[PDB]
Chains A and B, each alone.
Chain A
């Protein structure tokens, strides 16, 4: 009972930052980018000025 029970939570408890590397690149990739309807004339109202 000493062999089977730390291969499943340091395989599953040392891959937590392998549950760490998608949600801090959309909290400022989803916390440095707001909304839409204005991009669309970010290509219909500004080349020359």
Chain B
């Protein structure tokens, strides 16, 4: 295994990664960062 810097938040009873990959990946470029979808009302 290898040590890696990342943030881990405990919610409820489960330790989950809290990844917001917009900086390392999808950056300064031409790819659609998902999670910005649209809704129709």
Chain A residues in the interface with B (C-beta under 8 A): 47-49
**B22 near A: Cβ within 8 Å?**
yes
The interface residues of chain B, by DSSP majority, are classed as loop
The interface residues of chain A, by DSSP majority, are classed as loop
Q: Cβ of A47: which chain B residues have Cβ within 8 Å of it? A: 22, 26-29, 31, 33
In addition to A47-B22, A47-B26, A48-B29, 5 A-B residue pairs with Cβ atoms within 8 Å of each other are: A47-B27, A47-B28, A47-B29, A47-B31, A49-B30
Q: How far is the CA of A4 from the CA of B31 in the complex (A)?
A: 72
Q: Cβ of B33: which chain A residues have Cβ within 8 Å of it? A: 47-48
Q: How far is the CA of A47 from the CA of B27 in the complex (A)?
A: 6
Q: How far is the CA of A48 from the CA of B34 in the complex (A)?
A: 11
Q: How far is the CA of A39 from the CA of B30 in the complex (A)?
A: 21
